[PDB]
């Protein structure tokens with residue numbers, strides 16, 4: 001409803017999305033953060049004006065535009081100390097990038113520490129005027145964006161270091177155990193109409209098993225990739241994932257429960273917790289009294305495929321790529337590790353490091369956390385789950401790319417012929433060996449890490465330094481970008 005050219009003023013204030021008041025982060029003075037939209041191929045110019053004054057939730061900030069490849073604008077990608085130094089309070093910074101060849105549902109959020117959990121996170125839709133699925137629905141607008149999110153009554157830096165959510169928010173609203181009368185989100189449909197709902201997890205941690213009483217969901221997009229349509233009666237959505245699904249509002253006029261059950265915290269719907277309302281025009285303005293029927297047709301990610309049936313890059317056999325990497329997870333010192341190394345943010349961001357003359361992964365800080373990738377190649381990366389990295393299933397996100405999921409969680413099989421592609425994947429439960437493949441078509445340092453934010457805070461990340469020799473030439477930085485670091489580094493710690 002704003003964008004692709006817009007100011008995003010970031011500030012602190014009180015919010016009560018579950019009827020409990022707490023300080024948090026506002027964007028353009030509202031919580032939850034407003035929807036940004038654009039069309040396929042647009043240039044987004046988002047001027048992030050940082051007016052935050054609360055050091056507990058961090059005064060500085062950095063925004064990631066989740067899903068966008070940022071080709072040639074890797075400086076705009078957002079992650080703090082990888083792609084930029086944070087914007088300092090009292091200053092503003094323009095993200096100016098383009099979205100050639102991508103359309104679908106995205107989102108943005110702070111990518112500094114666990115700040116996004118404090119409320120800096122909103123959806124983004126990039127519409128396709130020739131969407132290949134346009135004929136499947138009648139309505140696709142601001143009122144068909146559905147966000148899911150976890151909500152804590154204690155700030156990120158105030159509660160336990162891996163806290164339990166007090167409430168699931170759906171479109172920024174929901175109930176906790178002690179605010180059972182708090183207002184529910186209502187999503188309205190007219191009988192006979194077909195809806196493209198764009199579901200996006202802004203979660204900092206839980207995954208949600210999502211369903212809508214008495215309705216089927218035809219899933220047609222996953223993480224901004226067009227799918228063959230695939231009807232399900234429920235879907236599990238991990239932190240940072242998006243699905244578009246067509247809902248045919250063909251049921252009787254009534255209220256139906258929308259259900260979003262987290263894998264942790266409160267795991268029932270007593271008193272309308274974990275819920276929002278799907279209201280048909282004409283139905284009473286009251287809660288649903290509908291009942292969950294067992295899901296007998298849940299989304300299975302190995303059954304999803306791309307609209308085009310695109311093969312995985314490389315050749316259809318394990319290790320059939322230019323470079324194959326294995327990410328061995330562990331945990332010690334109260335830090336997550338990958339291949340023995342815990343990510344600590346470097347003081348010089350990784351992008352600046354390459355621009356300043358780093359030539360190799362070995363040069364790049366932090367040591368042991370950065371992988372050099374060859375240019376113009378196929379890569380395979382295995383992310384095998386283990387009990388040594390507690391809080392599994394961990395959802396891993398690759399910045400700057402879409403990837404083929406050759407092997408999904410809960411499956412034993414490898415599909416190279418027509419696997420789903422997406423950009424956030426569950427790495428599943430011990431015994432799984434989630435395996436992804438992508439092409440190195442995008443020079444620059446790209447974060448690969450766990451989208452449980454409390455985990456990335458605890459080191460659960462690596463940097464893919466893609467095509468180092470071409471990073472500087474492919475990503476010319478604007479002067480405002482070059483100015484972020486000296487300004488940041490001048491801050492006293494209490495102002496960070």
Ligand SMILES: *[C@@H]1O[C@H](CO)[C@@H](O[C@@H]2O[C@H](CO)[C@@H](O)[C@H](O)[C@H]2NC(C)=O)[C@H](O)[C@H]1NC(C)=O
Pocket residue numbers: 022023024054055056057153154155158159
């Ligand atoms: C800055 O943000 C923090 C975190 O939101 C606020 O922390 C609160 O602190 C009070 C009193 O110490 C506690 O009773 C609350 O439980 C905290 N809230 C949260 C969400 O954890 C702090 O109040 C904020 N500062 C200002 C000046 O508003």
Ligand SMILES: *[C@@H]1O[C@H](CO)[C@@H](O[C@@H]2O[C@H](CO)[C@@H](O)[C@H](O)[C@H]2NC(C)=O)[C@H](O)[C@H]1NC(C)=O
Pocket residue numbers: 318324325326382384433
């Ligand atoms: C998960 O998959 C990866 C990728 O196939 C496995 O690592 C390979 O293991 C084979 C057989 O031992 C070796 O030849 C290679 O050295 C490994 N490839 C790479 C890129 O390291 C990994 O061992 C699997 N893990 C589990 C637990 O099944």
Ligand SMILES: [Cu+2]
Pocket residue numbers: 064066240397451
């Ligand atoms: Cu993200």
Ligand SMILES: [Cu+2]
Pocket residue numbers: 391393394395450451452455456460
């Ligand atoms: Cu994790």
Ligand SMILES: [Cu+2]
Pocket residue numbers: 064079111397399447449
């Ligand atoms: Cu990230």
